[model samples]
Target: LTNLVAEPFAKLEQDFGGSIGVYAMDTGSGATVSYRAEERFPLCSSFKGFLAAAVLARSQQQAGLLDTPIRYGKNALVRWSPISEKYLTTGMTVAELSAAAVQYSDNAAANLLLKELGGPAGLTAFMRSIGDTTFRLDRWELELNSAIPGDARDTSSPRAVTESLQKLTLGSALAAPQRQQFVDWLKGNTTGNHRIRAAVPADWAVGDKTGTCGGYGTANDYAVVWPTGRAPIVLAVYTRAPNKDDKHSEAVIAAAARLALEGLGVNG
Candidate 1:
């Protein structure tokens, strides 16, 4: 059912000088639109979204964990820590760290939370507990975004990502309150305005996470969307190129998302 409608994705990637992977699901009918969905692409900052979920999962068993304030020295500051940088002297709550990680892709907050979760491997374990076999996080920030071509480090298939995202956001991967918190964090993300959000109608309810590796033209976005009266649509789009200096295109990602929705008979 996807061959005819899927061709556009290939052309879109070609025009952007990269390879694009996409997986979109209509939860009501369990239908999907996939293209290179099983192939690996760098996870980049996208892992921050799941990192927040892992924190929420732990908060279920640990009382007052979310409200605990974390104070770090200037050394904690990294390349991208917009929210954390502002609160360097004041510190932030665990819940605020999680929110900053998801909503702003704050690197410092992510590293701080990752330490609490036992690093990349621990986060991977959480994904496995939720039934995602292909998701892996072998490195931490800055290093993980080194999207060397064909290097499988810190990578996952778009299918695996979308499946995990659905579980964490809408399924039983996290407790009710925590699940809603995860969705709320993604809903308010400030970094994805040009990607999947651009493909969705303004009236639809949508939440998403965006990642850019800053090299190899690696970038991606995963989203959960609700139409007026329908169940919901979950999707992921990932892109990478052969050359080291290749650039990622937000427009390309948006077009691929539009195609994914179109393939599922979702109106613009």
Candidate 2:
């Protein structure tokens, strides 16, 4: 898998006009690789995947009850939230908020969720439960407080990032129904379309989340790439663009996705 995966990326480096970093995992064989991928880069909003997973882990331990309702305040309150407005247009349950966070990369919704689940301590406890030591959440209050230009965030590793994803799909972390619900929401992610989305068919069952931070050149997509009639595979690519204009920089990500899919034996 390592040699198979490295072939396409060798081409991408020539096209992107800069050095590229990539980290990928084949969950079936427990194989993994990081090309310039070992060094940590900022997670941007991609950390939300870990946050969402933490929420589900807690929910399962509490006996499958992530349905608690969340009342949303005025838009002014959540206006700058990283979470999407669809979940905010109406209040959401804990389970529903998780859906929103992953589907829309809703920052506000995630803050609300971390609060509901019991803040940083709650999130930490959940990660510990999963034995995932690579995920760390700091400034939970800043995210929950929705303060501007402040340090409110979570962080994750590319290798660790894919593991969280694997847990979600394997149903080993969350219960059966929760796993299905979470992945279903992930399948419809609104971001990363130009890259992963363009690389696969609509019905391919790709589950992913994309994230960006304010005034930061960090953009990332972590996913469980599903090809029809085959075993699901996990691929996480986190990029630190010198520039933040994803619309223009999308080709970088698109190429990565295409090459990675081809490496996995997905046909054009």
Candidate 3:
């Protein structure tokens, strides 16, 4: 039955012309189920979660760091960003910008945060500090143009992302209320509704971050699902395709998440 539950993911890898990685774990028991969870893949915007966490952790000393406002003019616009387009001449608090980065997957907000954090190097150092060595923080947001090669983009394994999720929730990586705040941002995220949530119960409490890029990039979602009668579960699903519109990939993720929920004895 367990093997049967994973057949769909195997089929997706065979027929989808892309790689799919899934990692699901019971928060209380440390029991886990996975497929290619350790394989490297592009992280795309999923790195925003780490970025936000780094900023929040830094706030412990910086004091009022998240409340600081950042201004972006027309010249500072980042490509593929709705926030930049909407607020060309406007300013937003770091907290507000963090919400946009997580909730809306806003590229400009992410880039601005990246800039404040001193680009990918700072993020990479932060990840390493947390014992996550699989994430390679390489390029900046909107910097993935034709001039840049795919190898230069951000990348991580499902295991790394899953570990990061656990750190954010249960570890001392970030302080109490701030860690809770990050989780809430994910729960209230306004994007990627059709992926992990598609097959789960509508009332299930889910907190997640999603990442997507053009064809030849990645489509990913990582979440912590709270089922009413059971402990919270962490699920990370990542897919990569050479073509855009990977709806089947999303469906595969939804199916995998349901299977994981069932395996954990949680109602789907």
Top-scoring candidate (lDDT) = 1
Candidate 2 residue pairs in clash (backbone atoms < 3 Å): 82-106, 82-107, 82-108, 83-106, 83-107, 83-108, 84-106
What does candidate 2's lDDT look like per residue over 1-268, in tens digits? 5735555665675565444456666565655556656545556667666677777666666864577777777642454454546555667787777876777766678778777667766776677777777666666523522212223246556666676678767748888877777787778778778766777677777878876554334556777776677667787775553443422255676677666666655664
In angstroms, give how far residue 7 of model 3 lies from its true place: 5.0
lDDT of 1 by residue, 1-268 (tens): 4434554887788899989999998988888899999999999999999999999999999989999999999999999999999999999999999999989999999999999999999999999999999989998877999998888879999999999999988898899999998999999999999999999999999999999999988999999999778889999999999999998999999999999999988887
TM-score-better candidate, 1 vs 2 = 1
List the candidate 3 regions with Cα displacement exceeding 4 Å: 1-7, 144-153, 242-248
A best-first ranking of the candidates according to their TM-score comes to 1, 3, 2
lDDT of each: 0.92, 0.65, 0.77
Q: What is the TM-score of each candidate against the true structure?
A: 0.98, 0.80, 0.89
Which regions of candidate 2 fall more than 4 Å away from where they truly are? Answer: 8-19, 30-33, 80-90, 141-153, 242-248
On a 0 to 1 TM-score scale, where does candidate 2 land against the true structure?
A: 0.80
Rank the candidate models, highest lDDT first: 1, 3, 2
| Backbone Cα, N, C clashes tallied per candidate | 0, 7, 0
**Candidate 3: tens digits of C-alpha lDDT, residues 1-268:** 2222343567766666777888888877777777888877777788898889888888878989988978887766666576657766669899988888888888888888988888998998889988998887878876542112236457888878988888886577889988999888888888778888776688878888887766553678899888787778888888776555443356666766766676556666
